[PDB]
Design a protein around this nucleic acid. Structure first.
Ligand code: CA
Ligand code: CA
Ligand code: CA
Ligand code: NA
Length: 295
DNA sequence: GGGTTTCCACTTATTCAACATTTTAG
DNA sequence: CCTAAAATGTTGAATAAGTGGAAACC
C-alpha cells in the first residue's frame, strides 16, 4: 500500500518501461485499422510488488501474468494515459526512452482529437510508429506507400538527482561478491563489484556516471553483432565511501534491495578485515550463496 | 446497435544482469 | 610474496517490445 517517490519511479521507468502503439488491421473499423496507445512494465514474478506499488502511486494500469515467470503492468485506457503524461512532464525521462515518450505524446494528441478514426490520423500514427521502438513491420510499411523517416534526434541529458539513480539502479544495477581464486595466503580474494549495464545508444549517460558518482570505469562488450556497456566500480574505497552511501540515502526498490543489504554486510566485514579470516570468508561465502540468482 | 475501446493470454528477440576466471598494479 | 584492482570473456533469461482474441462499452 506504499507509494514510490516520483523520481525513483521515473528512473525505474527509464530502466524497465516501454511505450506501445498498436496499429491493427481491423475489418470492423471505418478506416480499416484500430489503435491502442500505452505504457507498460514487465518484470519477473518475484518483483510483482513493485508493479502493485506503481499502480497504487498512479491509480491506473492493470496487472496480468506475462508467461509463467513474469508479470506486467499495462496502461492503455485512454483517459488514464493523462496520468502517464502528467507524471513524465513533471519528472522527465533521461535515456533514449525520452524519445519514445515524445512519440507517445504525439500519438496521444492524434487520438485525443479523434483523428485516428480518419484516414489522415491513421497515416500520422503510422509515421509516428515508424520512429518508435522497432518501427513498422514490412506489412504495415507496404500498406502505407509513402516515404516515411525512421530517424529521430538522440537524447542527451544528465542524471537529474540521486532518486532517479536509485530507481534506475533498481532496474539495471547489479551488486555482487566476486570470489577470485588467488595466490593470497587464504587463496580466495573477495572483490565487491557494482555494475550497471546498458546498450551503447546511451553511452553518453553511461559515461557520465563516472563523473556523477566520482568513481568507476566503462567497458564495452560484443556478442556477435550486439554491443553493450558496463559501468563498474571495483575499488573498495569507492564502494564503501561513494556507492553504498548513495543507496542508503536513496533506497532501492524490489528484491534488488535485499541484495544491496547483503552486499553491505560483506562491505562491513571487509572494512573490519574479517575477509582475511577463515570465519569471515565462510560467512561471506554464505551471504553470497543467498544473493542474486541464489536467493 | 456496431464501431471502438480495453483487457487478458501469450510470443519473440535480445539487452541486460549475472558470473567466474585471468591478468595487472602496487 | 600478499592483496587489491582491473580486464577478459561468456551466458541465457528477465526484460523490453509485440500480437491474437474477444468482451463489452458508448
Ligand atoms: Ca533498459
Ligand atoms: Ca532492465
Ligand atoms: Ca577480449
Ligand atoms: Na531489472
Amino acid at each position: 500500500r506504499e507509494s514510490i517517490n516520483p523520481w525513483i519511479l521515473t528512473g525505474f521507468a527509464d530502466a524497465e518501461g516501454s511505450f506501445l502503439l498498436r496499429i491493427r488491421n481491423n475489418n470492423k473499423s471505418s478506416v480499416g485499422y484500430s489503435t491502442e496507445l500505452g505504457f507498460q512494465i514487465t518484470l519477473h514474478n518475484k518483483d510483482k510488488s513493485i508493479l502493485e506499488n506503481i499502480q497504487s502511486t498512479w491509480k491506473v494500469g492493470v496487472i496480468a501474468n506475462s508467461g509463467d515467470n513474469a508479470v506486467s503492468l499495462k496502461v492503455t485506457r485512454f483517459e488514464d494515459l493523462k496520468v502517464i503524461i502528467d507524471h513524465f512532464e513533471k519528472y522527465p525521462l533521461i535515456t533514449q526512452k525520452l524519445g519514445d515518450y515524445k512519440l507517445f505524446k504525439q500519438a496521444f494528441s492524434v487520438m485525443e482529437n479523434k483523428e485516428h478514426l480518419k484516414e489522415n490520423g491513421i497515416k500520422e500514427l503510422v509515421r509516428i510508429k515508424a520512429k518508435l521502438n522497432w518501427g513498422l513491420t514490412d506489412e504495415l510499411k507496404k500498406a502505407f506507400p509513402e516515404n516515411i523517416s525512421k530517424e529521430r534526434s538522440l537524447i542527451n541529458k544528465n542524471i537529474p538527482n540521486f532518486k532517479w539513480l536509485a530507481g534506475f539502479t533498481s532496474g539495471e544495477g547489479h551488486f555482487r561478491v566476486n570470489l577470485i581464486k588467488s595466490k593470497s595466503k587464504l587463496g580466495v580474494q573477495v572483490q565487491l563489484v557494482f555494475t550497471i549495464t546498458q546498450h551503447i545508444k546511451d553511452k553518453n549517460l553511461m559515461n557520465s556516471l563516472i563523473t556523477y558518482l566520482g568513481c568507476g570505469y566503462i567497458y564495452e562488450f560484443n556478442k556477435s553483432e550486439f554491443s553493450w556497456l558496463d559501468f563498474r566500480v571495483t575499488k573498495f574505497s569507492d564502494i564503501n565511501d561513494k556507492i553504498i552511501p548513495v543507496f542508503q540515502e536513496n533506497t532501492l526498490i524490489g528484491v534488488k534491495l535485499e541484495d544491496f543489504e547483503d552486499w553491505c554486510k560483506v562491505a562491513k566485514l571487509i572494512e573490519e578485515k574479517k575477509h582475511l579470516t577463515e570465519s569471515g570468508l565462510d560467512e561471506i561465502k554464505k551471504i553470497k550463496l543467498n544473493m542474486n540468482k541464489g536467493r
